[PDB]
Amino acid sequence: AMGRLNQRNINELKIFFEKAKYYSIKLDAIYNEYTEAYNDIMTYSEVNNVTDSDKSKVNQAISILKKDNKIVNKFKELEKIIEEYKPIFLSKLIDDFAIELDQAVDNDVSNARHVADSYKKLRKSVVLAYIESFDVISSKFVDSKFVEASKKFVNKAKEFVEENDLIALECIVKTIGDMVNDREINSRSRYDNFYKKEADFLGAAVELEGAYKAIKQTLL
Amino acid sequence: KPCDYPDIKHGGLYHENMRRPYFPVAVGKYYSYYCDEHFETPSGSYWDHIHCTQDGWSPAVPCLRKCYFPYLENGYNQNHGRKFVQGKSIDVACHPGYALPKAQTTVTCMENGWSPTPRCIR
Ligand SMILES: [Zn+2]
Ligand SMILES: [Zn+2]
Ligand SMILES: [Zn+2]
Ligand SMILES: [Zn+2]
Ligand SMILES: [Zn+2]
């Protein structure tokens, strides 16, 4: 029974990783398509002013954002991948952000900034949903060490998402992949520790892989 | 009277129909002129005076491009929202894990704004 559970738990985590293999890549394609718009909105919406105020650049960034309801279609694909784990917060924040795009006021830079702030908060929520989805699957295992290394990993991984959502997401996805596919984790920093939160996250990813390895081995 | 009515890119003289009957005009004579939005006189305003010179109209380039450097989301942002004039280069830098497209580092304020457009991509 303990092994019939741990077997299903190992299978659940593997089904998660394969289903969500592309989550980091897909979020980056969204970031990359919409960064110029987000930049234009932020540039001419500061209350410190002193930048004229091309309201047509802000109006164009909002149009790029709204076009063919695309960005909403792109976030809903990510919400579909995590679904078995209930991204209920996420579905609402996307539905809400879609309404934010529908209700946007041309020639109002403060509204534009508010749509742009909503995009940024949604994007980090999409990241958190992946972490929350993992914590759910990791909650069902019983091994004391794996559960402690899971809590520490999730805590350290949220701190990393709080610093940089997209950078956090890629090292998180690569860590799950490393564990799902019997590979050890690379603890060498990829950004000369520019992101102060990477090292403690990686330290936590190594300890979890040893505890996950130890569980796998009871079944071989 | 060497100077005919001036052709001014991105602007023109105030009061075209009032002033044209008086042309062509003597060396030393000057006229209020404007630049269209996105453009700037060499005095950094929306208007200046253009002078009839032995060498033609002065300033020779009466309207210049006004480029505001954008906020860059995962970028080093010292230059965010600062005003630059047509001809100005700036060396642009992204946070590690982000970079400018095509690995470019320099953007120049040109006739149609920044070239290339600086953005930090993943
Ligand atoms: Zn500022
Ligand atoms: Zn304009
Ligand atoms: Zn709102
Ligand atoms: Zn005319
Ligand atoms: Zn020009």
GROMACS .gro file of C-alpha atoms and ligand atoms in nm:
model
  347
    1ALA     CA    1   0.000   0.000   0.000
    2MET     CA    2   0.272   0.256   0.099
    3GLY     CA    3   0.443   0.158  -0.231
    4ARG     CA    4   0.116   0.146  -0.427
    5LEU     CA    5   0.074   0.508  -0.311
    6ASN     CA    6   0.435   0.616  -0.376
    7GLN     CA    7   0.408   0.445  -0.720
    8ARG     CA    8   0.096   0.645  -0.809
    9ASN     CA    9   0.260   0.957  -0.656
   10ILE     CA   10   0.571   0.905  -0.879
   11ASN     CA   11   0.336   0.851  -1.179
   12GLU     CA   12   0.126   1.165  -1.093
   13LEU     CA   13   0.446   1.384  -1.080
   14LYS     CA   14   0.570   1.229  -1.413
   15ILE     CA   15   0.225   1.291  -1.581
   16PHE     CA   16   0.243   1.656  -1.450
   17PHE     CA   17   0.598   1.718  -1.590
   18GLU     CA   18   0.510   1.575  -1.942
   19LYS     CA   19   0.176   1.767  -1.955
   20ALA     CA   20   0.351   2.095  -1.840
   21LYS     CA   21   0.691   2.028  -2.016
   22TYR     CA   22   0.648   2.352  -2.224
   23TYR     CA   23   0.502   2.590  -1.956
   24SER     CA   24   0.827   2.796  -1.920
   25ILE     CA   25   0.877   2.820  -2.303
   26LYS     CA   26   0.505   2.912  -2.357
   27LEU     CA   27   0.509   3.190  -2.088
   28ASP     CA   28   0.831   3.333  -2.244
   29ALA     CA   29   0.671   3.347  -2.596
   30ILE     CA   30   0.391   3.559  -2.432
   31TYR     CA   31   0.644   3.783  -2.245
   32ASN     CA   32   0.844   3.834  -2.573
   33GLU     CA   33   0.538   3.920  -2.792
   34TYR     CA   34   0.397   4.176  -2.541
   35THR     CA   35   0.713   4.335  -2.374
   36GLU     CA   36   0.741   4.633  -2.621
   37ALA     CA   37   0.371   4.726  -2.553
   38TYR     CA   38   0.420   4.693  -2.169
   39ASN     CA   39   0.738   4.910  -2.201
   40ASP     CA   40   0.551   5.178  -2.407
   41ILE     CA   41   0.264   5.192  -2.147
   42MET     CA   42   0.508   5.217  -1.848
   43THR     CA   43   0.724   5.483  -2.027
   44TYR     CA   44   0.437   5.735  -2.079
   45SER     CA   45   0.228   5.669  -1.759
   46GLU     CA   46   0.475   5.770  -1.482
   47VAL     CA   47   0.334   6.051  -1.257
   48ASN     CA   48   0.689   6.198  -1.244
   49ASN     CA   49   0.595   6.291  -1.606
   50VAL     CA   50   0.872   6.482  -1.798
   51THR     CA   51   0.825   6.264  -2.113
   52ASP     CA   52   0.556   6.454  -2.309
   53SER     CA   53   0.286   6.183  -2.324
   54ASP     CA   54   0.233   6.017  -2.662
   55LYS     CA   55  -0.116   5.887  -2.578
   56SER     CA   56  -0.114   5.728  -2.926
   57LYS     CA   57   0.181   5.506  -2.830
   58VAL     CA   58  -0.015   5.403  -2.516
   59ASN     CA   59  -0.331   5.363  -2.729
   60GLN     CA   60  -0.127   5.146  -2.977
   61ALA     CA   61   0.022   4.927  -2.694
   62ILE     CA   62  -0.338   4.863  -2.562
   63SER     CA   63  -0.454   4.763  -2.919
   64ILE     CA   64  -0.152   4.526  -2.956
   65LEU     CA   65  -0.258   4.379  -2.613
   66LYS     CA   66  -0.634   4.342  -2.704
   67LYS     CA   67  -0.594   4.222  -3.071
   68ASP     CA   68  -0.795   3.901  -3.167
   69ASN     CA   69  -0.832   3.835  -2.784
   70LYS     CA   70  -0.492   3.654  -2.836
   71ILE     CA   71  -0.305   3.707  -2.500
   72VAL     CA   72  -0.616   3.571  -2.314
   73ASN     CA   73  -0.617   3.267  -2.552
   74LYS     CA   74  -0.240   3.225  -2.471
   75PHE     CA   75  -0.289   3.237  -2.089
   76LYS     CA   76  -0.589   2.995  -2.103
   77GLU     CA   77  -0.366   2.728  -2.267
   78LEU     CA   78  -0.145   2.744  -1.954
   79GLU     CA   79  -0.457   2.729  -1.730
   80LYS     CA   80  -0.565   2.414  -1.924
   81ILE     CA   81  -0.228   2.232  -1.862
   82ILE     CA   82  -0.249   2.277  -1.482
   83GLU     CA   83  -0.626   2.200  -1.471
   84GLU     CA   84  -0.623   1.860  -1.286
   85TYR     CA   85  -0.474   2.062  -0.995
   86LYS     CA   86  -0.744   2.338  -1.015
   87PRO     CA   87  -0.603   2.678  -1.124
   88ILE     CA   88  -0.936   2.827  -0.999
   89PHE     CA   89  -0.763   3.150  -0.892
   90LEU     CA   90  -0.596   3.158  -1.236
   91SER     CA   91  -0.916   3.111  -1.442
   92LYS     CA   92  -1.075   3.412  -1.264
   93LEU     CA   93  -0.761   3.633  -1.293
   94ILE     CA   94  -0.758   3.563  -1.670
   95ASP     CA   95  -1.136   3.615  -1.704
   96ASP     CA   96  -1.092   3.939  -1.492
   97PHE     CA   97  -0.788   4.056  -1.703
   98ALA     CA   98  -0.993   3.989  -2.027
   99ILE     CA   99  -1.266   4.225  -1.887
  100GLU     CA  100  -0.981   4.473  -1.805
  101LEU     CA  101  -0.890   4.464  -2.182
  102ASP     CA  102  -1.263   4.494  -2.284
  103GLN     CA  103  -1.319   4.798  -2.046
  104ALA     CA  104  -0.990   4.984  -2.135
  105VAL     CA  105  -1.018   5.367  -2.185
  106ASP     CA  106  -0.840   5.518  -2.490
  107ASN     CA  107  -0.655   5.848  -2.403
  108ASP     CA  108  -0.635   5.748  -2.028
  109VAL     CA  109  -0.265   5.663  -1.941
  110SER     CA  110  -0.360   5.572  -1.577
  111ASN     CA  111  -0.605   5.303  -1.705
  112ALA     CA  112  -0.334   5.181  -1.953
  113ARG     CA  113  -0.085   5.151  -1.658
  114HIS     CA  114  -0.358   4.958  -1.461
  115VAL     CA  115  -0.412   4.712  -1.756
  116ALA     CA  116  -0.029   4.678  -1.774
  117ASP     CA  117   0.002   4.625  -1.392
  118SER     CA  118  -0.277   4.358  -1.425
  119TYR     CA  119  -0.084   4.175  -1.706
  120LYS     CA  120   0.236   4.167  -1.482
  121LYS     CA  121   0.040   4.033  -1.174
  122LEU     CA  122  -0.142   3.774  -1.393
  123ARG     CA  123   0.196   3.658  -1.542
  124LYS     CA  124   0.342   3.589  -1.188
  125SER     CA  125   0.014   3.409  -1.087
  126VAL     CA  126   0.059   3.175  -1.392
  127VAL     CA  127   0.406   3.100  -1.244
  128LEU     CA  128   0.264   3.048  -0.887
  129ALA     CA  129  -0.007   2.809  -1.025
  130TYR     CA  130   0.275   2.573  -1.147
  131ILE     CA  131   0.436   2.578  -0.795
  132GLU     CA  132   0.088   2.539  -0.627
  133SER     CA  133   0.016   2.244  -0.873
  134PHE     CA  134   0.344   2.074  -0.763
  135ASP     CA  135   0.283   2.136  -0.383
  136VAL     CA  136  -0.059   1.956  -0.436
  137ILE     CA  137   0.102   1.644  -0.597
  138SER     CA  138   0.386   1.656  -0.333
  139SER     CA  139   0.124   1.682  -0.047
  140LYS     CA  140   0.006   1.319  -0.119
  141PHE     CA  141   0.344   1.147  -0.047
  142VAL     CA  142   0.407   1.043   0.318
  143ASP     CA  143   0.791   1.013   0.351
  144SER     CA  144   0.895   1.253   0.628
  145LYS     CA  145   1.214   1.369   0.452
  146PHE     CA  146   1.046   1.424   0.107
  147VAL     CA  147   0.759   1.623   0.268
  148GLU     CA  148   1.007   1.847   0.457
  149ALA     CA  149   1.226   1.889   0.144
  150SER     CA  150   0.907   1.962  -0.057
  151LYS     CA  151   0.788   2.244   0.181
  152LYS     CA  152   1.143   2.399   0.182
  153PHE     CA  153   1.161   2.372  -0.204
  154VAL     CA  154   0.816   2.535  -0.253
  155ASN     CA  155   0.898   2.811   0.002
  156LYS     CA  156   1.244   2.872  -0.161
  157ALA     CA  157   1.083   2.858  -0.514
  158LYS     CA  158   0.816   3.125  -0.431
  159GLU     CA  159   1.090   3.360  -0.294
  160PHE     CA  160   1.262   3.308  -0.636
  161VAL     CA  161   0.936   3.384  -0.832
  162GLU     CA  162   0.897   3.700  -0.607
  163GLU     CA  163   1.242   3.823  -0.742
  164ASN     CA  164   1.192   3.722  -1.116
  165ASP     CA  165   0.881   3.520  -1.222
  166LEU     CA  166   1.014   3.395  -1.564
  167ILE     CA  167   1.373   3.314  -1.442
  168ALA     CA  168   1.228   3.133  -1.137
  169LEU     CA  169   0.991   2.934  -1.370
  170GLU     CA  170   1.267   2.799  -1.599
  171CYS     CA  171   1.497   2.670  -1.311
  172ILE     CA  172   1.179   2.525  -1.133
  173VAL     CA  173   1.062   2.337  -1.452
  174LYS     CA  174   1.424   2.210  -1.520
  175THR     CA  175   1.448   2.084  -1.154
  176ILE     CA  176   1.114   1.889  -1.175
  177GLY     CA  177   1.235   1.745  -1.513
  178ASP     CA  178   1.574   1.648  -1.361
  179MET     CA  179   1.392   1.455  -1.079
  180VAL     CA  180   1.122   1.300  -1.305
  181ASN     CA  181   1.388   1.169  -1.546
  182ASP     CA  182   1.660   1.035  -1.299
  183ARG     CA  183   1.919   1.313  -1.355
  184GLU     CA  184   2.106   1.495  -1.075
  185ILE     CA  185   2.056   1.874  -1.040
  186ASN     CA  186   2.316   2.130  -1.163
  187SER     CA  187   2.379   2.357  -0.858
  188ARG     CA  188   2.609   2.596  -1.059
  189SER     CA  189   2.447   2.946  -1.094
  190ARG     CA  190   2.353   3.052  -1.454
  191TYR     CA  191   2.356   3.430  -1.373
  192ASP     CA  192   2.673   3.479  -1.155
  193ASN     CA  193   2.413   3.493  -0.865
  194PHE     CA  194   2.258   3.822  -1.002
  195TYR     CA  195   1.923   3.674  -0.877
  196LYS     CA  196   2.001   3.650  -0.500
  197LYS     CA  197   1.726   3.381  -0.459
  198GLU     CA  198   1.868   3.121  -0.710
  199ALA     CA  199   2.134   2.956  -0.480
  200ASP     CA  200   1.900   2.871  -0.181
  201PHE     CA  201   1.640   2.745  -0.439
  202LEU     CA  202   1.906   2.521  -0.607
  203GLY     CA  203   2.033   2.405  -0.264
  204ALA     CA  204   1.670   2.301  -0.190
  205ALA     CA  205   1.627   2.133  -0.538
  206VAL     CA  206   1.933   1.906  -0.468
  207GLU     CA  207   1.804   1.788  -0.124
  208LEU     CA  208   1.457   1.712  -0.271
  209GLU     CA  209   1.607   1.506  -0.558
  210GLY     CA  210   1.793   1.292  -0.301
  211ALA     CA  211   1.475   1.244  -0.099
  212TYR     CA  212   1.277   1.175  -0.425
  213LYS     CA  213   1.555   0.936  -0.545
  214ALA     CA  214   1.533   0.755  -0.204
  215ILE     CA  215   1.155   0.702  -0.246
  216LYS     CA  216   1.193   0.582  -0.611
  217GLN     CA  217   1.456   0.322  -0.498
  218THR     CA  218   1.215   0.149  -0.245
  219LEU     CA  219   1.016   0.041  -0.558
  220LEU     CA  220   1.313  -0.096  -0.772
  221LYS     CA  221   1.658   8.881  -5.243
  222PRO     CA  222   1.822   8.530  -5.268
  223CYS     CA  223   1.589   8.319  -5.037
  224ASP     CA  224   1.264   8.174  -5.179
  225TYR     CA  225   0.984   8.034  -4.959
  226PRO     CA  226   1.138   7.755  -4.749
  227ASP     CA  227   1.043   7.383  -4.773
  228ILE     CA  228   1.068   7.252  -4.409
  229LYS     CA  229   1.051   6.878  -4.336
  230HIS     CA  230   0.822   6.790  -4.032
  231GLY     CA  231   0.687   7.151  -4.001
  232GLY     CA  232   0.665   7.490  -4.183
  233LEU     CA  233   0.624   7.868  -4.134
  234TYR     CA  234   0.347   8.023  -3.927
  235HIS     CA  235   0.103   8.229  -4.141
  236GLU     CA  236   0.192   8.079  -4.490
  237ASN     CA  237  -0.074   8.284  -4.686
  238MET     CA  238  -0.009   8.615  -4.496
  239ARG     CA  239   0.374   8.590  -4.552
  240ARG     CA  240   0.422   8.435  -4.905
  241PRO     CA  241   0.348   8.755  -5.109
  242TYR     CA  242   0.669   8.909  -4.954
  243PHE     CA  243   0.904   8.631  -5.091
  244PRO     CA  244   1.172   8.610  -5.209
  245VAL     CA  245   1.347   8.786  -4.915
  246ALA     CA  246   1.680   8.964  -4.830
  247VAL     CA  247   1.974   8.806  -4.636
  248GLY     CA  248   1.920   8.882  -4.261
  249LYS     CA  249   1.535   8.835  -4.265
  250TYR     CA  250   1.387   8.562  -4.034
  251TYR     CA  251   1.044   8.394  -3.976
  252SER     CA  252   0.872   8.204  -3.690
  253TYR     CA  253   0.833   7.828  -3.777
  254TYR     CA  254   0.695   7.512  -3.604
  255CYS     CA  255   0.780   7.138  -3.596
  256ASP     CA  256   0.509   6.871  -3.592
  257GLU     CA  257   0.462   6.636  -3.294
  258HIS     CA  258   0.755   6.392  -3.233
  259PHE     CA  259   0.979   6.668  -3.373
  260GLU     CA  260   1.187   6.946  -3.212
  261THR     CA  261   1.365   7.269  -3.322
  262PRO     CA  262   1.743   7.281  -3.243
  263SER     CA  263   1.648   7.510  -2.943
  264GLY     CA  264   1.448   7.209  -2.804
  265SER     CA  265   1.103   7.371  -2.859
  266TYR     CA  266   0.792   7.342  -3.087
  267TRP     CA  267   0.891   7.675  -3.259
  268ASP     CA  268   1.204   7.879  -3.356
  269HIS     CA  269   1.304   8.135  -3.627
  270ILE     CA  270   1.450   8.033  -3.968
  271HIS     CA  271   1.697   8.293  -4.115
  272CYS     CA  272   1.779   8.382  -4.482
  273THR     CA  273   2.161   8.325  -4.514
  274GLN     CA  274   2.405   8.374  -4.811
  275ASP     CA  275   2.437   7.989  -4.782
  276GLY     CA  276   2.048   7.944  -4.781
  277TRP     CA  277   1.801   7.882  -4.492
  278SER     CA  278   1.942   7.840  -4.133
  279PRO     CA  279   1.904   7.620  -3.943
  280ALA     CA  280   1.971   7.380  -4.240
  281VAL     CA  281   1.792   7.100  -4.047
  282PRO     CA  282   1.507   7.293  -3.881
  283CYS     CA  283   1.310   7.001  -3.723
  284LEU     CA  284   1.477   6.707  -3.539
  285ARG     CA  285   1.353   6.376  -3.397
  286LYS     CA  286   1.261   6.368  -3.027
  287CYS     CA  287   1.314   6.010  -2.886
  288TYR     CA  288   1.219   5.931  -2.520
  289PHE     CA  289   1.420   5.623  -2.404
  290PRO     CA  290   1.167   5.359  -2.290
  291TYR     CA  291   1.135   5.174  -1.955
  292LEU     CA  292   1.278   4.821  -2.018
  293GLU     CA  293   1.110   4.554  -1.803
  294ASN     CA  294   1.415   4.328  -1.731
  295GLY     CA  295   1.668   4.604  -1.823
  296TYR     CA  296   1.919   4.840  -1.655
  297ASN     CA  297   1.686   5.149  -1.656
  298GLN     CA  298   1.910   5.461  -1.575
  299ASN     CA  299   1.787   5.621  -1.905
  300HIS     CA  300   1.407   5.548  -1.859
  301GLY     CA  301   1.197   5.841  -2.000
  302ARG     CA  302   1.500   6.078  -2.061
  303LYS     CA  303   1.471   6.290  -2.385
  304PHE     CA  304   1.731   6.233  -2.664
  305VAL     CA  305   1.770   6.407  -3.006
  306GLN     CA  306   1.802   6.256  -3.361
  307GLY     CA  307   2.166   6.134  -3.407
  308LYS     CA  308   2.211   6.012  -3.043
  309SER     CA  309   2.329   5.651  -2.975
  310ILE     CA  310   2.273   5.476  -2.638
  311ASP     CA  311   2.435   5.140  -2.535
  312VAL     CA  312   2.148   4.929  -2.389
  313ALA     CA  313   2.189   4.645  -2.133
  314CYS     CA  314   1.944   4.371  -2.014
  315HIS     CA  315   1.946   4.179  -1.680
  316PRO     CA  316   2.115   3.835  -1.713
  317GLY     CA  317   1.876   3.575  -1.865
  318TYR     CA  318   1.741   3.859  -2.091
  319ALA     CA  319   1.891   4.020  -2.399
  320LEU     CA  320   1.818   4.252  -2.692
  321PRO     CA  321   1.709   4.089  -3.018
  322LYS     CA  322   1.992   4.000  -3.264
  323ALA     CA  323   2.239   4.056  -2.976
  324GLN     CA  324   2.248   4.431  -3.051
  325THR     CA  325   2.375   4.677  -2.784
  326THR     CA  326   2.336   5.018  -2.954
  327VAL     CA  327   2.006   5.196  -3.045
  328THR     CA  328   2.012   5.532  -3.235
  329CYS     CA  329   1.742   5.808  -3.249
  330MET     CA  330   1.665   5.821  -3.627
  331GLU     CA  331   1.394   5.982  -3.853
  332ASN     CA  332   1.129   5.722  -3.737
  333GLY     CA  333   1.242   5.690  -3.370
  334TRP     CA  334   1.475   5.433  -3.200
  335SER     CA  335   1.646   5.187  -3.444
  336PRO     CA  336   1.645   4.908  -3.359
  337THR     CA  337   1.357   4.917  -3.097
  338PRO     CA  338   1.520   4.827  -2.758
  339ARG     CA  339   1.340   4.548  -2.564
  340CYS     CA  340   1.478   4.282  -2.320
  341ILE     CA  341   1.365   3.937  -2.440
  342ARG     CA  342   1.381   3.581  -2.304
  343ZN      ZN  343   1.081   5.728  -1.331
  344ZN      ZN  344   0.218   6.026  -3.192
  345ZN      ZN  345  -0.926   4.714  -1.267
  346ZN      ZN  346   0.290   7.525  -4.741
  347ZN      ZN  347   1.387   6.454  -4.024
   0.00000   0.00000   0.00000
